[PDB]
Homo-oligomer: 114 residues x 4
């Protein structure tokens, strides 16, 4: 199944934050309506916050997360969870190797802000 793609409410500010847990250098791209809106990169095995940014879901609400390591696309897992019918989290994990921890880059999207 497709993973790392989320439909947000249109024209809504959201946070996106990436964490690294791998020997490999992670590169995370965040697309909004297929336009590159953010790119984060770094290397840590201790959960470094390689990037955090406020974006806007725009007219389409379509947000996609992609992760690669020195050009190789990582396999993704994802889900969205809503608390008290209001508070939204869109979650991504990614695997760059063979141990299947899916934590090599972790991406958390949250809304609403403010």
């Amino acid at each position: 199944a497709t993973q790392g793609v989320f439909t947000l409410p249109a024209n809504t500010r959201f946070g996106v934050t990436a964490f690294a847990n791998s020997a490999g250098t992670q590169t995370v791209n965040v697309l909004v309506n297929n336009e590159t809106a953010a790119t984060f990169s770094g290397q840590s095995t201790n959960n470094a916050v390689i990037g955090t940014q406020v974006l806007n879901s725009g007219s389409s609400g379509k947000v996609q997360v992609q992760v690669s390591v020195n050009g190789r696309p990582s396999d993704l897992v994802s889900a969205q969870v809503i608390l008290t019918n209001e508070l939204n989290f869109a979650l991504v994990g990614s695997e760059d190797g063979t141990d299947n921890d899916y934590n090599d880059a972790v991406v958390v999207i949250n809304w609403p802000l403010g």
Copy 2:
């Protein structure tokens, strides 16, 4: 029901990261077996990261998040999500006021780490 309380695997490293979205200064306390292990503070209405840290769940595995604003504990919502039977998120929102966005302080706990 109790919120913001999570049983992690014993003696396991985890990340904890807090974001703020309130006019008020948020204080986030992370407790491991009922003892404060990290404290973050800050004020933002733009989802700023007010802290991030790596902790160990210790011999009991018991982790709790508490949030307070202007000397007053905030109400919490929370849940845990597991993706591909491996990647764990413990998610918390908090409400300090009247509007019920539960985003005043947003706290993300993730494990395993690298």
Copy 3:
């Protein structure tokens, strides 16, 4: 925070299914747009499906689950999860007693159907 209230897409069919795991008879009421749309009752300590039904979310999309034992409201917990940006589950647990399993009645709402 409010629990057991979900916003579904308008004019969409959904399933609602209730399970019982308590010494006490559970009553589950499902409201759509503030009108009772389904009701199930039963006692089981073995996860009986005390009712399952297909409903339409109508113009509002507002769906509320209430659980009671002989007229006494149970405390609820709830969340919504979305898989592959398409498959939705709204989840409710309830506690009628002192042991805090929140499984006394468990309610699952799923959409889309068909």
Copy 4:
């Protein structure tokens, strides 16, 4: 990533319930310790319950859900959610065709039971 595999606590009862939303006949297999523990087959486009059973998780606690239609394995999506640090849901969707609803068979696993 692997989907439909969940680690439950050892020697613990859980409920499994399958719903169908497809023109095709769905076959849902539940494997406990890599051996078939339940099988459900049926057809509905109205979310009918094609099986519901209580099972034990056994020594390893490893539970796997597989879905097929006309003998051809369906693609799966899944996740696990925990409410109030106690109430567990393991959730599976499956796609037998081209429309990507992942509702063709929907499987809900819940624990603890009464």
